[PDB]
Enzyme design. Structure first.
Site, PDB file in Angstrom:
ATOM      1  N   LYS A 220      53.687   7.546  27.589  1.00  0.00           N
ATOM      2  CA  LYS A 220      55.134   7.554  27.245  1.00  0.00           C
ATOM      3  C   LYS A 220      55.706   6.141  27.151  1.00  0.00           C
ATOM      4  O   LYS A 220      56.845   6.048  26.681  1.00  0.00           O
ATOM      5  CB  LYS A 220      55.852   8.471  28.236  1.00  0.00           C
ATOM      6  CG  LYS A 220      55.560   9.930  27.908  1.00  0.00           C
ATOM      7  CD  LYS A 220      56.168  10.826  28.915  1.00  0.00           C
ATOM      8  CE  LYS A 220      55.891  12.296  28.638  1.00  0.00           C
ATOM      9  NZ  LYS A 220      56.675  13.109  29.571  1.00  0.00           N
TER      10      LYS A 220
ATOM     11  N   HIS B 187      61.046  18.844  35.109  1.00  0.00           N
ATOM     12  CA  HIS B 187      59.823  19.133  34.331  1.00  0.00           C
ATOM     13  C   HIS B 187      58.877  19.963  35.219  1.00  0.00           C
ATOM     14  O   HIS B 187      58.852  19.782  36.408  1.00  0.00           O
ATOM     15  CB  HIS B 187      59.205  17.811  33.907  1.00  0.00           C
ATOM     16  CG  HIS B 187      57.994  17.883  33.028  1.00  0.00           C
ATOM     17  ND1 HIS B 187      56.743  18.353  33.448  1.00  0.00           N
ATOM     18  CD2 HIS B 187      57.838  17.461  31.766  1.00  0.00           C
ATOM     19  CE1 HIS B 187      55.891  18.223  32.451  1.00  0.00           C
ATOM     20  NE2 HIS B 187      56.535  17.663  31.403  1.00  0.00           N
TER      21      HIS B 187
ATOM     22  N   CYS C 247      58.964  21.682  28.618  1.00  0.00           N
ATOM     23  CA  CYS C 247      58.250  21.790  29.885  1.00  0.00           C
ATOM     24  C   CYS C 247      59.403  21.881  30.965  1.00  0.00           C
ATOM     25  O   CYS C 247      59.217  21.382  32.107  1.00  0.00           O
ATOM     26  CB  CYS C 247      57.074  20.731  30.048  1.00  0.00           C
ATOM     27  SG  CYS C 247      55.513  21.052  29.052  1.00  0.00           S
TER      28      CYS C 247
ATOM     29  N   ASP D  60      60.095  11.575  40.112  1.00  0.00           N
ATOM     30  CA  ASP D  60      59.462  11.737  38.771  1.00  0.00           C
ATOM     31  C   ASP D  60      60.099  10.702  37.825  1.00  0.00           C
ATOM     32  O   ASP D  60      61.219  10.921  37.338  1.00  0.00           O
ATOM     33  CB  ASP D  60      59.579  13.169  38.272  1.00  0.00           C
ATOM     34  CG  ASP D  60      58.954  13.393  36.924  1.00  0.00           C
ATOM     35  OD1 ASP D  60      58.594  12.391  36.265  1.00  0.00           O
ATOM     36  OD2 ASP D  60      58.877  14.539  36.509  1.00  0.00           O
TER      37      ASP D  60
ATOM     38  N   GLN E 253      60.355   9.361  32.626  1.00  0.00           N
ATOM     39  CA  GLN E 253      61.298   9.029  31.537  1.00  0.00           C
ATOM     40  C   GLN E 253      62.194   7.868  31.952  1.00  0.00           C
ATOM     41  O   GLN E 253      63.039   7.479  31.107  1.00  0.00           O
ATOM     42  CB  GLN E 253      62.164  10.192  31.094  1.00  0.00           C
ATOM     43  CG  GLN E 253      61.428  11.361  30.547  1.00  0.00           C
ATOM     44  CD  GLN E 253      60.830  11.165  29.193  1.00  0.00           C
ATOM     45  OE1 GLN E 253      61.231  10.281  28.424  1.00  0.00           O
ATOM     46  NE2 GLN E 253      59.908  12.065  28.898  1.00  0.00           N
TER      47      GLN E 253
HETATM   48  C1  LIG Z   1      56.052  13.741  30.455  1.00  0.00           C
HETATM   49  C2  LIG Z   1      56.646  14.120  31.716  1.00  0.00           C
HETATM   50  C3  LIG Z   1      55.857  14.649  32.839  1.00  0.00           C
HETATM   51  C4  LIG Z   1      54.370  14.835  32.715  1.00  0.00           C
HETATM   52  O1  LIG Z   1      53.651  13.649  32.391  1.00  0.00           O
HETATM   53  P1  LIG Z   1      52.171  13.845  31.777  1.00  0.00           P
HETATM   54  O2  LIG Z   1      51.832  12.487  31.325  1.00  0.00           O
HETATM   55  O3  LIG Z   1      52.270  15.073  30.814  1.00  0.00           O
HETATM   56  O4  LIG Z   1      51.307  14.385  32.856  1.00  0.00           O
HETATM   57  C5  LIG Z   1      56.530  14.865  34.019  1.00  0.00           C
HETATM   58  N1  LIG Z   1      57.826  14.649  34.150  1.00  0.00           N
HETATM   59  C6  LIG Z   1      58.640  14.223  33.184  1.00  0.00           C
HETATM   60  C7  LIG Z   1      60.119  14.042  33.439  1.00  0.00           C
HETATM   61  C8  LIG Z   1      58.073  13.984  31.881  1.00  0.00           C
HETATM   62  O5  LIG Z   1      58.831  13.569  30.881  1.00  0.00           O
END
Ligand SMILES: *Cc1c(COP(=O)(O)O)cnc(C)c1O
Ligand SMILES: *Cc1c(COP(=O)(O)O)cnc(C)c1O
Ligand SMILES: [Zn+2]
Ligand SMILES: [Zn+2]
Lengths: 148, 410, 408, 150
Positions: B226, B125, B366, B200, B203
């Protein structure tokens, strides 16, 4: 059906797109991308010997039915027209598609352009419809600067 | 799982969409929906105990401060962190930015500079890419990356680390291919140069059991909105010993211990990293979201989501000219399912689904370097949450079939 | 204004505190209370129209995007900005940090470096102080400050015209002394060196009419939660022409124009300055708070608060050994009222007030250099909102007399 | 009366007439602690016996509220003359009582006048006022013990 958005004129230009393929001569060239991720266009505008009329709009790139149909319809409305008349048509189109369901558009001014009236109700797709039109507006302004 | 009882917690799932059909929300990958337990935990706080945190000494201040620090503890328990190892940000993006800025600060002993290498992946992302490009730009460090396998996994063969590597940033769980990444292998490799790991986990935290101590990463970011929680709250995890060594990022009130016009000294972590009034009612909400998911059980959540994912892959695979971006197996894979319809642009596929009340994301999600690597300008993306159903997967498959018929492909 | 009607909008104001008295909430200066219009605007959005903003193209994304951008328009109208001049942050603090980082960025033409001077004030909240210390540390620029007059005002006679001054940061409205600052004079002086101005408007936007174009500042920061809005939303104002010249601060999704592994180009303002998922439901709530205040009318809000402030200053000044930090005069003055009780520590004053259901802040109020300038360890602070009453001021005065009796 | 229950006589007495106030020599460690509840501060010294086994003095100065200043005064009366480990046990009993949100009344046999701060526990913001001098002592004692040999 509730599409409506996907009018026959739109499907027709998508399957049978007019003036596709970059041509020479041209007086300006622009590269535009949909804020909605997935549509792009490279668009050329040629002007007459005296700079008063649009003699050609040529373009390439990939995008959805609405972006490609809108750009085909643009070229049909604007080629052979006086620059000010081209500018007026772009304003008419932008006002219609940007109005939500509110402005039907004038078929005397827009021709097949009015087929995109249904898109106004779907604001995400309005950006699809505007891509080629705002690309032409850019390229026209640049080609007229070029002229002098 | 009592799926009917879980779905009954979410008022938005009853919505009739403009085409006349009940919502089938398959875009929890972008943002999740809110259960009453989350909405109510935040409203009850706001109408009873709303006061400044860690500021003054009156009754509402004590109740608010209790709610803020108990919420931090609840969220830490959920993700296998100590309470003091969580820092609240506006979103996961800011959490990754915070690490990217501190790693360029002359006061951090692990700060990167000329000669040092930052590693990310072509799977990432944008949140786990752009801040590393900017850190390289500011410091003179250089950026390298793992590539992606033809099945949308991190290609561990595509990059050899060396002693210059100081940072290894990567996804736990791809927001496009759904791949679950080999964390213990990447941590082991990062450790061969004493490199810091940044995970990260946006998800992973909503979709599977997560134990950040177990994973042995230095940093992790996740997103409240999320995991059924409020907007306006992200989370940075940092190992206690690393946070203690880091200078602040954002500065201001509440993060100081002394102040003159000339200079300041800074509070210990995590308060060091929290400048200004925090998102107090959003901590209360996210804590309620963590307790809600904890009560269902994240193993049960993952098992349910994996059933929807497998049915989605099976149903979409059966459509002529549909291809999946990511694995067609369930090996080390979860939500979401991103796909291409040959001869139908993703914008059109998504409009046909939406006409049926089915919400999917269309575009690059993204993750444009990932799309470009596969020669794709956009995909349609069906992401799954605990509230989604096999009947909604059938509606997804029907809508994609319809989009082929409607656009004259067959 | 109907004060009883206004108070009926705020569920928390009915609360009975542990001492058995109804809440008298005199700490809106730290965080304000929420009326039902704000709670319900947010919850209605979340239970009907919650989708990603500017990402994808389905119905919920269109509704969420409409709510996000209409909320930006509503708030801009409220503060006399154009829609495109507002950037959403998690808080006012982050807004001042954003400016403090962009002013150190090699890609910004107006960035500061060695030999340059940053000016702040000794009156400032820490949010409008520490980021300038850090910018000085990173760039090698020099920090200077206006001092404070004996009546708790910015001392305009304490600094002089210096071509090296490139940034001037100052409060609109002190969170301790309540003084309303001479913005027009400070801007005119800043312009004499081509300096950028940064206005801390956290205590003006909730409490008085604010027109940011009229004020002629380059940047301003304010805080949602202080103006009846949600937690987790701050606002940075930036003049359009300046935001267009400015490199990004936080980077990631949503703020890019193009991206490869090698690099990225950035979206125009204000999207350039909003990295990742925004505080979408909080924008809805903050727009509802702006409409709420707008429906009362900010002149009427300021008149009501000025009545309470004067009553507080006059009632406390009527207690032997009680001193105001800031002016006793109402000239160029509003909320709040910070005071010392001779011989009674601020922690003991606040505890006695709390026993009577009166919530005040005790300590330095995030303005320690201001307290130090007056030789004070701590003050008690009564701050006022549109929902506060003359009877709550009487309870404040009574509690401070009680504290003198109890400890005296 | 709720106010009397937090502000017990012992507290008002030590506040009005504090004990062992004013920094003295000799001393083994010096600390400076500040209450996060901005307004209370203490400079505190610990002196140990020749053999390092007993606290022989706790000297201090600084400024704060009735609760922070009374607690430091009471601390000095409880730990002066006591074996280092017995002083440590007394500090742990005090911290457990005041951190207890009112579930622990404290043992007057271990805490003496220390028990007068029981009514502070249900005011969690004021707990940092009471802990200021006691945590200052814990810090100084551990520095004075480490300092000793060698
Ligand atoms: C949603 C997401 C982001 C960004 O999170 P935000 O809450 O938009 O700042 C970063 N990495 C992954 C893998 C995502 O799914
Ligand atoms: C509240 C306040 C700030 C900080 O705002 P947050 O919302 O806490 O970040 C800055 N300046 C002034 C004058 C304030 O009152
Ligand atoms: Zn399109
Ligand atoms: Zn105290």
């Amino acid at each position: 059906r509730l599409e409506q958005i996907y009018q026959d004129v739109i499907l027709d230009h998508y399957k049978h797109p007019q003036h596709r393929g970059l041509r020479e001569p041209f007086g300006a060239q622009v590269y535009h991308v949909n804020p909605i991720c997935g549509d792009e266009v490279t668009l050329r505008v040629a002007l007459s010997e005296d700079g008063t009329r649009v003699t050609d709009v040529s373009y390439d790139g990939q995008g959805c039915s609405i972006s490609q149909a809108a750009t085909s319809v643009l070229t049909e409305q604007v080629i052979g027209q006086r620059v000010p008349r081209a500018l007026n048509i772009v304003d008419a189109f932008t006002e219609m598609v940007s109005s939500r369901g509110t402005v039907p558009g004038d078929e005397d001014v827009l021709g097949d352009g009015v087929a995109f009236a249904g898109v106004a109700k779907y604001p995400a797709r309005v950006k699809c419809a505007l891509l080629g039109w705002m690309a032409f507006k850019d390229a026209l302004a640049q080609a007229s600067e070029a002229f002098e | 799982l009592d799926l009917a009882a879980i779905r009954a917690d979410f008022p938005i799932l009853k919505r009739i969409m403009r085409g006349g059909n009940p919502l089938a929300y398959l875009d929890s990958g972008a943002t999740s929906q809110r259960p009453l337990q989350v909405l109510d935990a935040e409203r009850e706080f706001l109408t009873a105990s709303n006061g400044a945190v860690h500021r003054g000494a009156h009754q509402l201040m004590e109740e608010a401060t209790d709610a803020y620090e108990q919420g931090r503890a609840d969220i830490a328990l959920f993700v296998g962190a100590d309470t003091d190892e969580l820092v609240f940000t506006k979103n996961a993006t800011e959490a990754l930015n915070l690490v990217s800025y501190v790693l360029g600060d002359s006061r951090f002993e692990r700060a990167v500079g000329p000669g040092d290498v930052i590693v990310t992946t072509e799977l990432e992302h944008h949140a786990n890419l752009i801040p590393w490009q900017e850190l390289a730009r500011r410091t003179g460090a250089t950026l390298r990356w793992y590539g992606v396998t033809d099945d949308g996994r991190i290609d561990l063969d595509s990059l050899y680390l060396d002693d210059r590597v100081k940072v290894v940033a990567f996804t736990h769980h791809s927001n496009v291919t759904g791949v679950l990444t080999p964390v213990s292998e990447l941590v082991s490799r990062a450790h061969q140069s004493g490199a810091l790991t940044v995970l990260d986990a946006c998800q992973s935290v909503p979709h599977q059991p997560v134990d950040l101590h177990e994973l042995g990463v230095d940093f992790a970011a996740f997103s409240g909105h999320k995991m059924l929680g409020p907007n306006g709250i992200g989370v940075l995890y940092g190992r206690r010993e690393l946070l203690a060594q880091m200078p602040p990022f954002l500065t201001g009130g509440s993060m100081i211990e002394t102040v003159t016009m000339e200079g300041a000294t800074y509070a210990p972590a995590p308060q060091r990293f929290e400048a200004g009034t925090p998102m107090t009612s959003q901590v209360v909400g996210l804590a309620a979201a963590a307790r809600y998911l904890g009560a269902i059980g994240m193993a049960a959540v993952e098992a349910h989501e994996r059933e929807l994912v497998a049915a989605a892959i099976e149903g979409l695979s059966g459509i002529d000219g549909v291809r999946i971006l990511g694995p067609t197996s369930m090996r080390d894979r979860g939500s979401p399912v991103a796909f291409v319809v040959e001869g139908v642009h993703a914008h059109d596929v998504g409009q046909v689904l939406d006409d049926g009340g089915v919400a999917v994301r269309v575009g690059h999600h993204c993750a444009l370097p990932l799309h470009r690597r596969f020669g794709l300008a956009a995909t349609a993306r069906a992401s799954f949450a605990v509230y989604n159903t096999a009947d909604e997967v059938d509606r997804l498959v029907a809508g994609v079939r319809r989009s082929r018929h409607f656009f004259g492909r067959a």
